[PDB]
Amino acid sequence: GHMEKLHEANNELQKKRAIIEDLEPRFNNSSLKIEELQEALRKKEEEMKQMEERYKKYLEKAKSVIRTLDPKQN
Amino acid sequence: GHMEKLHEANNELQKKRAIIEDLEPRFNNSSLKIEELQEALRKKEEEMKQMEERYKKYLEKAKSVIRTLDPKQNQ
């Protein structure tokens, strides 16, 4: 047949059309997601570096409170 | 005539085939990516939980000291 091969071809085109319309919004969503997961990851890793700044500075501060309050040197 | 319609259709098929063949591995990679990231991020919110627990620890030693040396508690 010839008429019958046009039918098989047009239907497969409708099939691929449906495959594409379903997968595209999915792939777009998942792209957005990867971006926000990395802004969260970056923003968290920054918080962690600050958190280490503070505890570090705290320990150094208490190092000098010890000197100030020690009688054996003051 | 009919020749041309079956040629236009078969070549549109190869177009859509190319679209799909290119997007599908991309979408698979990105599904794996989302879950690798979400893992890294929860291993990181954990590391943070430990570090805030450690800093809150130290911040309550510190006010313990601010209270004992409070002039008002020494009179």
Residue numbers in the entry:
A (entry chain A): 550 to 623
B (entry chain B): 550 to 624
Question: Which text from the study accompanies this structure?
Answer:
Next, we attempted to crystallize Hook3(553–624) and KIF1C(714–809), separately and as a complex (marked in red). The crystal structures of Hook3(553–624) in an apo form and in a complex with KIF1C(714–809) were determined to resolutions of 2.7 Å and 3.0 Å, respectively. Even though Hook3 exists in a parallel coiled-coil form in both structures, the two Hook3 structures did not exactly match up when superimposed.
